[PDB]
């Protein structure tokens with residue numbers, strides 16, 4: 001292979017590895033924020049579904 | 064002129080007209096917390112695949 005091909009094949013390789021490296025760092029910081037604040041799709045621990053509640057009038061009024 | 068109600072009359076659910084206004088927050092509820100911001104958009108392939116260590120796919 002000529003030096004030009006290897007040279008520019010290297011730039012292609014470095015672009016992919018740099019982009020992957022940045023995403024790896026970003027994911028660690030996103031995971032840190034999502035877990036601490038609970039405001040994202042990850043670390044979304046379930047709460048009781050509200051469709052289970054019955055809103056019909058009860059046997060007694062104060063409820 | 065009092066007529067005795069029939070069997071089943073007094074257990075009927077009836078409608079009643081009232082001039083009292085329907086209560087607004089009978090449970091005295093606080094404001095509900097806002098929902099988590101919805102994630103929407105077009106699902107695109109993962110950028111450079113899994114990106115797990117050396118794997119290229």
Ligand SMILES: CCCCCCCCCCCCCCCCCC(=O)OC[C@H](COP(=O)(O)OCCN)OC(=O)CCCCCCCCCCCCCCCCC
Pocket residue numbers: 117118119120
């Ligand atoms: C396993 C072979 C190596 C044997 C020695 C053991 C080495 C240590 C094993 C630990 C794991 C290290 C494996 C390192 C490679 C994994 C990363 C990788 O290869 O990238 C993802 C790979 C796609 O490879 P890619 O770069 O896109 O090239 C495509 C070429 N068509 O996609 C993959 O991840 C799948 C590739 C796994 C590598 C083996 C499969 C290659 C395909 C040949 C299968 C055989 C087909 C012939 C069947 C013959 C039947 C008799």
